[PDB]
Design a protein around this motif. Sequence first.
Motif, mmCIF file in Angstrom:
data_model
loop_
_atom_site.group_PDB
_atom_site.id
_atom_site.type_symbol
_atom_site.label_atom_id
_atom_site.label_comp_id
_atom_site.label_asym_id
_atom_site.label_seq_id
_atom_site.Cartn_x
_atom_site.Cartn_y
_atom_site.Cartn_z
ATOM 1 N N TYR A 175 -35.314 45.848 28.556
ATOM 2 C CA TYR A 175 -33.971 46.336 28.290
ATOM 3 C C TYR A 175 -33.095 46.193 29.532
ATOM 4 O O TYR A 175 -33.610 46.048 30.644
ATOM 5 N N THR A 176 -31.777 46.199 29.342
ATOM 6 C CA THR A 176 -30.845 45.898 30.435
ATOM 7 C C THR A 176 -30.756 47.002 31.482
ATOM 8 O O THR A 176 -30.625 46.720 32.675
ATOM 9 N N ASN A 177 -30.834 48.256 31.045
ATOM 10 C CA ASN A 177 -30.814 49.367 31.995
ATOM 11 C C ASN A 177 -32.162 49.577 32.666
ATOM 12 O O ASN A 177 -32.305 50.453 33.526
ATOM 13 N N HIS A 178 -33.145 48.771 32.256
ATOM 14 C CA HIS A 178 -34.454 48.697 32.915
ATOM 15 C C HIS A 178 -34.441 47.755 34.100
ATOM 16 O O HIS A 178 -35.359 47.761 34.905
ATOM 17 N N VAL A 179 -33.384 46.956 34.229
ATOM 18 C CA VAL A 179 -33.227 45.987 35.321
ATOM 19 C C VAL A 179 -33.335 46.628 36.716
ATOM 20 O O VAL A 179 -34.358 46.472 37.398
ATOM 21 N N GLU A 180 -32.291 47.360 37.115
ATOM 22 C CA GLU A 180 -32.175 47.925 38.462
ATOM 23 C C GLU A 180 -33.412 48.720 38.839
ATOM 24 O O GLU A 180 -33.900 48.632 39.965
ATOM 25 N N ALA A 181 -33.915 49.489 37.881
ATOM 26 C CA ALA A 181 -35.089 50.311 38.090
ATOM 27 C C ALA A 181 -36.345 49.454 38.303
ATOM 28 O O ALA A 181 -37.107 49.687 39.244
ATOM 29 N N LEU A 182 -36.552 48.454 37.446
ATOM 30 C CA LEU A 182 -37.689 47.541 37.604
ATOM 31 C C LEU A 182 -37.554 46.726 38.885
ATOM 32 O O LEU A 182 -38.536 46.562 39.626
ATOM 33 N N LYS A 183 -36.338 46.231 39.149
ATOM 34 C CA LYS A 183 -36.014 45.563 40.412
ATOM 35 C C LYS A 183 -36.785 46.232 41.561
ATOM 36 O O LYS A 183 -37.422 45.560 42.383
ATOM 37 N N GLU A 184 -36.733 47.567 41.572
ATOM 38 C CA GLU A 184 -37.262 48.416 42.639
ATOM 39 C C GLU A 184 -38.773 48.654 42.555
ATOM 40 O O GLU A 184 -39.440 48.833 43.579
ATOM 41 N N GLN A 185 -39.304 48.674 41.335
ATOM 42 C CA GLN A 185 -40.755 48.783 41.117
ATOM 43 C C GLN A 185 -41.468 47.577 41.710
ATOM 44 O O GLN A 185 -42.639 47.656 42.103
ATOM 45 N N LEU A 186 -40.733 46.469 41.789
ATOM 46 C CA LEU A 186 -41.229 45.230 42.364
ATOM 47 C C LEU A 186 -41.422 45.309 43.868
ATOM 48 O O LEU A 186 -41.960 44.395 44.483
ATOM 49 N N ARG A 187 -40.972 46.400 44.463
ATOM 50 C CA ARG A 187 -41.087 46.558 45.892
ATOM 51 C C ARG A 187 -42.273 47.456 46.257
ATOM 52 O O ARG A 187 -42.336 48.034 47.350
ATOM 53 N N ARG A 188 -43.230 47.536 45.332
ATOM 54 C CA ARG A 188 -44.413 48.378 45.487
ATOM 55 C C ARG A 188 -45.686 47.572 45.407
ATOM 56 O O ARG A 188 -45.865 46.769 44.504
ATOM 57 N N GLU A 189 -46.559 47.790 46.380
ATOM 58 C CA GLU A 189 -47.888 47.197 46.387
ATOM 59 C C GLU A 189 -48.800 47.930 45.433
ATOM 60 O O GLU A 189 -48.858 49.152 45.454
ATOM 61 N N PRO A 190 -49.485 47.176 44.561
ATOM 62 C CA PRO A 190 -50.583 47.684 43.776
ATOM 63 C C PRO A 190 -51.673 48.279 44.659
ATOM 64 O O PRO A 190 -52.044 47.717 45.695
ATOM 65 N N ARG A 191 -52.148 49.433 44.211
ATOM 66 C CA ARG A 191 -53.165 50.192 44.864
ATOM 67 C C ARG A 191 -54.420 50.010 44.039
ATOM 68 O O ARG A 191 -54.327 49.705 42.836
#
Lengths: 498, 498
Positions: free
Chosen positions: A441-457
């Motif tokens: 979804y479009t309002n999931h953009v900015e938020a997901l954008k930022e999830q991409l800045r996290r290393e998998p643990r």
Amino acid sequence: KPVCLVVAMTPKRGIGINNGLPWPHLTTDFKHFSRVTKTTPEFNAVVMGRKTWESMPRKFRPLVDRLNIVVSSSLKEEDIAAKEGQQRVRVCASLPAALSLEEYKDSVDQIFVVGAGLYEAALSGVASHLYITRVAREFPCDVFFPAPGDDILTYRPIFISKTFSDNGVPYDFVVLEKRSSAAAIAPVLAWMDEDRELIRAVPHVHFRGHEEFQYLDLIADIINNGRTMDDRTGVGVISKFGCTMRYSLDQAFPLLTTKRVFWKGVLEELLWFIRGDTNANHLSEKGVKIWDKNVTREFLDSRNLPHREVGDIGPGYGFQWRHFGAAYKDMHTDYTGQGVDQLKNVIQMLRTNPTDRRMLMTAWNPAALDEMALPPCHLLCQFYVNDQKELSCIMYQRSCDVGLGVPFNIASYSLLTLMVAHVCNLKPKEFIHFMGNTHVYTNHVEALKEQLRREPRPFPIVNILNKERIKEIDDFTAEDFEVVGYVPHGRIQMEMAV
Amino acid sequence: KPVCLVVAMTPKRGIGINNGLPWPHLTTDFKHFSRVTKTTPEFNAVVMGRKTWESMPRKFRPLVDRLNIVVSSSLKEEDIAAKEGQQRVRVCASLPAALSLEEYKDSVDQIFVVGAGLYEAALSGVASHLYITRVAREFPCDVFFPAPGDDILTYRPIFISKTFSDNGVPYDFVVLEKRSSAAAIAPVLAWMDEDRELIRAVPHVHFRGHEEFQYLDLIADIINNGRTMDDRTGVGVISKFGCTMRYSLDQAFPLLTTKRVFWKGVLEELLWFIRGDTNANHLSEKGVKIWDKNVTREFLDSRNLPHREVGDIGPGYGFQWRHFGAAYKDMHTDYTGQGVDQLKNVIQMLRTNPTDRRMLMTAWNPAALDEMALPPCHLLCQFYVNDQKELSCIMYQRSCDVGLGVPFNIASYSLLTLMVAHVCNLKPKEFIHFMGNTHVYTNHVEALKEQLRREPRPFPIVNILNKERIKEIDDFTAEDFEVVGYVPHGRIQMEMAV
Ligand SMILES: NC(=O)C1=CN([C@@H]2O[C@H](COP(=O)(O)OP(=O)(O)OC[C@H]3O[C@@H](n4cnc5c(N)ncnc54)[C@H](OP(=O)(O)O)[C@@H]3O)[C@@H](O)[C@H]2O)C=CC1
Ligand SMILES: NC(=O)C1=CN([C@@H]2O[C@H](COP(=O)(O)OP(=O)(O)OC[C@H]3O[C@@H](n4cnc5c(N)ncnc54)[C@H](OP(=O)(O)O)[C@@H]3O)[C@@H](O)[C@H]2O)C=CC1
Ligand SMILES: C#CCN(Cc1ccc2[nH]c(N)nc(=O)c2c1)c1ccc(C(=O)N[C@@H](CCC(=O)O)C(=O)O)cc1
Ligand SMILES: C#CCN(Cc1ccc2[nH]c(N)nc(=O)c2c1)c1ccc(C(=O)N[C@@H](CCC(=O)O)C(=O)O)cc1
Ligand SMILES: Nc1nc(=O)c2nc(CNc3ccc(C(=O)N[C@@H](CCC(=O)O)C(=O)O)cc3)cnc2[nH]1
Ligand SMILES: Nc1nc(=O)c2nc(CNc3ccc(C(=O)N[C@@H](CCC(=O)O)C(=O)O)cc3)cnc2[nH]1
Ligand SMILES: O=c1ccn([C@H]2C[C@H](O)[C@@H](COP(=O)(O)O)O2)c(=O)[nH]1
Ligand SMILES: O=c1ccn([C@H]2C[C@H](O)[C@@H](COP(=O)(O)O)O2)c(=O)[nH]1
């Protein structure tokens, strides 16, 4: 000039208690530790502190096929005389001094630092890379590792391993870093081509072995190579249609570390799926309100069922699972007897005829859709047992919602697979993911954008507790589980589209 | 001082007639013929014969941004254009004498020779590589190519394109040829890979972009990474469980070349799924016997249906598509009106609500399995349209016989997609393959692998004939089609495990 540092570690930076290691002999690490510090392809130096030297077993402790140096002041030569090739073990006043001992340059090609305080010393330039086993199951320690950030909620990540497990411990391995013939045929590769994309996940981490990346790169591709589509809700989608993710279960369980997954409810829904509940009200008040918004008086009206007692998902999901083909009455009706119990067969089959190729579970009955709160997202799966009595799953999903549900929906069936694995008397191999219109979804953009800045643990282990009172898939009860060494990032608020 | 040729020929090696080119303007080739001949990431030379020069319209004649040399004794002096004005033209005596123009060697990196008479003398001694546009149709010609072994039934491959097409012409592009720290990362990759005869499809083809490779590679992995199993029949397979493939449609249809597809039956079968007939004695009677195998008196008696008229597949695929959940009587019974017409909803939706995520077709009706000759392989499909009014398909197969059926299967649901695309008034883009237990019988071990040696040939393009008269899916008739430029190797023949 340059050096490396082997560390296993609890996520909060613990290393060794009462002079030892606090974890039960984890063996896939002992491989790793060995075959790093021993190799220059087919000798190295291992420089430890005095107390690091002590925590070793007597037979083990001349660390084999590499030189050892011990930063010690009391002991020096009482060490050996304690008995081919194997180098006289040295003692060096300090760590900068260990380095000086270079009489030695060329005679060794890699130096590896195996101690706390000694670790602080290393940081106080020296190194470049830091070989780090991320241990996720916490234990009590006294000797802790010094001050790069993540591990808990500079030396930059360059490798993430895929999460392993021994004797109850989930852990992955990481790497921190200080900060013609062939060509003659490119003329044509040149033109059929278009190249870099560049809204990609985690770029500086080159080797990407932590299975979660499928998902994170499933995000990138979506916004990168997806199309901006309308859908039912009124909230804009960006879709690809058709993707895939398969995950390892035979070590650690695939709960998304990237953001705190909602475990609780994916468990509670599965049961609800195992049970056959159609009253979403039975969920709601146990704290799980994910379905609350798909059965509201206001919504069933806009699904043309004015005849439904807010909650009733009708013959949805699990109903189609346990009671296929029946005339569904109401979320209070005891349906025990009506319709095909697909799910009954799968296990009957698996425990007698595992070589069968009829182990499925269809939630798509066309003679229904306009009776349910909504027609099924995850609509079908299949089960399989190969050589090693290992169970494996495929589930097929019509509509995958990546910001929100997918994460959820992922565990759901991975979790289920464990469920099935156990009842049938097996050890669980791989879950796999086949998806229809795949979108964000479009309002999931900015938020997901930022999830991409996290290393998998490192992934968790999920245990079935009470394996001996559990004999069938119903004997499963919301308690019989242990979510262990799960170390999530912070939850990301992403709005659901009604 | 060896060189490359710019061919563009039919399977029998035909190249030009009455001084022109025998195929209608093919643009994807013309670009390809542009970009190749002027390059090496920061001119080249183009050498040709007299009549090869008189081919070009004078506006094209100066072949811009390259050097043009023409070996001929007749033509000495020209001017048709005669500004920058970098080009410079030159005439010659013979080809080895054009080579003898090295002045020039610095000023030009590589020379390309673009026909007949000059082609046969370029082999008869230098060369090395051959830029060849495999053209899949034949046409009337007079000027042919010299002495081929892979246009129809040395210079070895290296690169295969992916079959493009312009103006009804399918064609591949092919190439023939004469015959700082990550050192840290290594130590760990080393051990993880540690299990590491692997047979492989045409390994002397480096760039593998045709598409059929997916399938050929699909074979490789199956025997290479799959398990020796006992299956229903009692034959024995090698299986992987969980593979995929997705094929380009908007240029050329993916009819398999390595072995002759049994096209004929594929077409008939789908229609017989479009019709929904269950009596396989209809099928038998048009010369398609793939199904007459699982509906014998002895097979339905081995399916504990003593009451089924040799042939009656039961309420199988088609029946489940057009009349869902309805009481099935016999293979003659007119059922017209009963149950859900899954398919009819699909077109209905697609012409109106394309952005829907409810465009499917399930044949897994578990309230049936005990009735049918066999439980469905190709069980579920899904239709999707992006904003480019293009269609796409996923099908889901529970079980797959790679040797024989898969190829067959491949066309069916591709062929379908074309239908669905045309009827809904759309231009089809892609089919996609999702398979469960994916396996090859052990008596297909040798036949396949001999298939592994065969090159893919350019794919054929399939046409719907009578597009006007065709308005719904039924308006389709076994003859409304042509298969254009299909050039298979011989069919291998692989027995079916009854
Ligand atoms: N999980 C893992 O990766 C690791 C686990 N562990 C654990 O950690 C614990 C011990 O660690 P730790 O307490 O820090 O002991 P150390 O291995 O760091 O050794 C400490 C001693 O070594 C000497 N020394 C260390 N640093 C210096 C320095 N900068 N300058 C001068 N001398 C120095 C001193 O010896 P002296 O007193 O003789 O002068 C000091 O008392 C154990 O429980 C052990 O098992 C150990 C290594 C790694
Ligand atoms: N599809 C494709 O990729 C190609 C298409 N075509 C087509 O092919 C046809 C023409 O080809 P083709 O008939 O073979 O004519 P050519 O282009 O080979 O030219 C023939 C003439 O060139 C000279 N020549 C060529 N070879 C030699 C030699 N070995 N030694 C000495 N002189 C030589 C002679 O010229 P002279 O008599 O003046 O002494 C000869 O008569 C056309 O229909 C054209 O469109 C052409 C190029 C490639
Ligand atoms: C998949 C699935 C099952 N479902 C059912 C469900 C129903 C309708 C849907 N509708 C849409 N548009 N997307 C979905 O993912 C979705 C999922 C879920 C529904 C909500 C959440 C959810 O809201 N997760 C949040 C908050 C939950 C909480 O803490 O209470 C989160 O933590 O991220 C998860 C799963
Ligand atoms: C998929 C599917 C539909 N089917 C139905 C069908 C039914 C049972 C099966 N059983 C098994 N074990 N494997 C199959 O592939 C299979 C396929 C097919 C059945 C046969 C052929 C076949 O015999 N093809 C041969 C010879 C045909 C001929 O006489 O020309 C060939 O040319 O390769 C193809 C498709
Ligand atoms: N990642 C990591 N894991 C560790 O266990 C570890 N341990 C130390 C210190 N503790 C120990 C204790 C015993 C042995 C040991 O017996 N080593 C054997 C391994 C045996 C094998 O090959 O499996 C060796 O010879 O290397 C090593 C280190 C320092 N850095 C580490 N780093
Ligand atoms: N693969 C291949 N395809 C061909 O069409 C071809 N044609 C020739 C000779 N015939 C012709 C006729 C016209 C033009 C021509 O007009 N050339 C333009 C292409 C225009 C474009 O860039 O799209 C050129 O400038 O190169 C080229 C070759 C020789 N080798 C070939 N090789
Ligand atoms: O298990 C589920 C259930 C629902 N959804 C999401 C996907 C779609 O975005 C959304 C809406 O459903 P449809 O409009 O596709 O019916 O629900 C999932 O991703 N997983
Ligand atoms: O469309 C089809 C029909 C049948 N089969 C093959 C797959 C299995 O090898 C075989 C036997 O069927 P089951 O035993 O899996 O039912 O039929 C296909 O691959 N595709």
